Amino acid sequence: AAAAAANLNAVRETMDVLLEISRILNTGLDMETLSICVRLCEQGINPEALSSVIKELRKATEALK
Amino acid sequence: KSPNVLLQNLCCRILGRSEADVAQQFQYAVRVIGSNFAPTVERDEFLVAEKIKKELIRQRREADAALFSELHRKLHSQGVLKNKWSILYLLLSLSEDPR
Amino acid sequence: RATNAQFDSPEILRRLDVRLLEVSPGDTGWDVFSLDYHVDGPIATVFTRECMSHYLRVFNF
């Protein structure tokens, strides 16, 4: 109602503060991928396993070109 | 969201392709993520936060080390996350120094 | 022990060591090369701990 629109506002705050953390450390991810990894993290996911996929997807965007 | 479509959704952000253009990369994602869908280590947010500070020292900046304290304050302030260790270890592990 | 710092006291050069910086995804040894002098006892107050943390920042420059 109201607290769930404050929730919907606090999630747009959370992606922005994680975008700030993503840019100051100079990671490869942009804002569009960053909204997917958090959805993966709410269900529970191993970041050691996700990082091995992320270091291959971005190295396979120019191996199918 | 189902995980099988969510990993495909990751594959469509990284590779700019349709969800049926690319299924080899999506197959490698289903290959790796499966049977390790839970973290393999003990976790707390505090240790990886104090290593993100160690990461900001490595790039020769200490003003962001005190800005990142308030950026991690906002995460505790909202409380809309399930795992705050996991995304932060991911963003730490994918880092790179510009030198 | 191949230069003009062999003529100094052995204790001071002995306590020096190379240290690898805390946390690093794979990159040059230039970013993670450091030195650490071991010191204990009474003079650890004159050689203040926080002052060593600033000394490494001078050392990087």
UniProtKB/Swiss-Prot annotation, chain A:
Natural source organism: Homo sapiens (Human)
Protein name per the record: Mitotic-spindle organizing protein 1
Family stated for the protein in its record: Belongs to the MOZART1 family.
Part of the whole protein covered: 11 to 75 of 82
Domain of life: Eukaryota
GO cellular component, one term: spindle
SS bonds (residue pairs): none
Oligomer and partners: Associates with the gamma-tubulin ring complex (gTuRC) consisting of TUBGCP2, TUBGCP3, TUBGCP4, TUBGCP5 and TUBGCP6 and gamma-tubulin TUBG1 or TUBG2; within the complex, interacts with TUBGCP3 and TUBGCP6 to form a luminal bridge with actin that stabilizes the initial structure during complex assembly. Interacts with TUBG1.
Described function: Required for the recruitment and the assembly of the gamma-tubulin ring complex (gTuRC) at the centrosome. The gTuRC regulates the minus-end nucleation of alpha-beta tubulin heterodimers that grow into microtubule protafilaments, a critical step in centrosome duplication and spindle formation.
Coiled-coil stretches: none
UniProtKB/Swiss-Prot annotation, chain B:
Coiled-coil boundaries: none
Compartments in which it is found: Cytoplasm, Cytoskeleton, Microtubule organizing center, Centrosome
Tissue specificity: Ubiquitously expressed.
Subunit structure comment from the entry: Component of the gamma-tubulin ring complex (gTuRC) consisting of TUBGCP2, TUBGCP3, TUBGCP4, TUBGCP5 and TUBGCP6 and gamma-tubulin TUBG1 or TUBG2. TUBGCP2, TUBGCP3, TUBGCP4, TUBGCP5 and TUBGCP6 assemble in a 5:5:2:1:1 stoichiometry; each is associated with a gamma-tubulin, thereby arranging 14 gamma-tubulins in a helical manner. Gamma-tubulin at the first position is blocked by TUBGCP3 at the last position, allowing 13 protafilaments to grow into a microtubule.
Similarity field: Belongs to the TUBGCP family.
The protein's role, per its UniProt record: Component of the gamma-tubulin ring complex (gTuRC) which mediates microtubule nucleation. The gTuRC regulates the minus-end nucleation of alpha-beta tubulin heterodimers that grow into microtubule protafilaments, a critical step in centrosome duplication and spindle formation.
Protein name: Gamma-tubulin complex component 3
UniProt source species: Homo sapiens
Portion of the full-length sequence here: 7 to 105 of 907
